[PDB]
Structure formats: structure tokens, C-alpha cells
């Protein structure tokens, strides 16, 4: 309803992950398959990872779609960019230290 021509592809995988591929376009152009946008969403969590390719033009629209489809109110961008997705996953979920002292 916001744009006119846009391609959306979903892939629901375990680890509670949803991969979304988006090909952007408007009322007077066809969807460009050369510059897609990738999103990784974790269900029932306030975090979502995105690939910075072309969303600089449609960032508010993507934020609105994410905050409406997931039944939220606000959305903000964290000052944390990195090429290693697993490192970001471990840092954001703060599960990089898995050593606990116990006598058992």
C-alpha cells in the first residue's frame, strides 16, 4: 500500500529466524533485482538485523513495516555495525560469556 511494485520473499528457519529479501520499486519503475535488501528477524524479540545496501532511501518505510507487523510502537537504530553477523548476535543477546561456577 505504500509503494506499488515491490518484491518480498520469506524464509522461516529454526533458531527462530525469518529471512526477508526485498526488491524495491515505485509506481513508475519495475523492482530492481540487482540491489536487494536482506532482513533477519527473531520472533518475540525486540531486535532485527539488516543489510545496509539501499535502505537509505526507504528507511522510515521499512521501520514502519517492521514496527507494525510485529505489534510494536517505536523503533531506533543502535550504534553497532559489523560484517560478522554471529558476533553481533552474541553481543546484542549478551551471551558471549557462558562460564558459571557451580559444584555439581
Amino acid at each position: 500500500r505504500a509503494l506499488k511494485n515491490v518484491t518480498v520473499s520469506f524464509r522461516e528457519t529454526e533458531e527462530n529466524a525469518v529471512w526477508i529479501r526485498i526488491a524495491w520499486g515505485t509506481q513508475y519503475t519495475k523492482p530492481n533485482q540487482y540491489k536487494p535488501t536482506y532482513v533477519v528477524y527473531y520472533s518475540q524479540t525486540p531486535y532485527a538485523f539488516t543489510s545496509s545496501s539501499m535502505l537509505r532511501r526507504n528507511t522510515p518505510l521499512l521501520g514502519q513495516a517492521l514496527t507494525i507487523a510485529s505489534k510494536h510502537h517505536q523503533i531506533v537504530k543502535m550504534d553497532l555495525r559489523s560484517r560478522y553477523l554471529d558476533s553481533l548476535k552474541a553481543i546484542v543477546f549478551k551471551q558471549y560469556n557462558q562460564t558459571f561456577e557451580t559444584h555439581n
Binding site: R1, K4, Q27, Y28
Partner: protein, 53 residues
Amino acid sequence: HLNFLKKRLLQQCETLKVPPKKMEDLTNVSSLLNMERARDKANEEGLALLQEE
């Protein structure tokens, strides 16, 4: 006589003066008109939908 009067009309067009104007070749008139009609209809319906929303 046809070619004679045709050359004469060519000369008469050469002697005439007119303020300058610009366009392209004549083979792509109908095609460009159809593309512009289609684009106009598409833009109109899109604007109507956006305005209703």
C-alpha cells in the same frame, strides 16, 4: 513537373525564417505518444490511490 515544384517548395522553405524549436525523428511519434498515455494513466491511478489512503 512534380519534382520541379518539389525543388521549388524546397527553395521556398529555405528562404523562409522561423523562431527555433526542437524535437526528434518522426518514426517514434506514435510509440512515444502511447508510452506517455500509459505513464499518464498509471500516475493518475497511483495518485488517486495515495490520496484516498
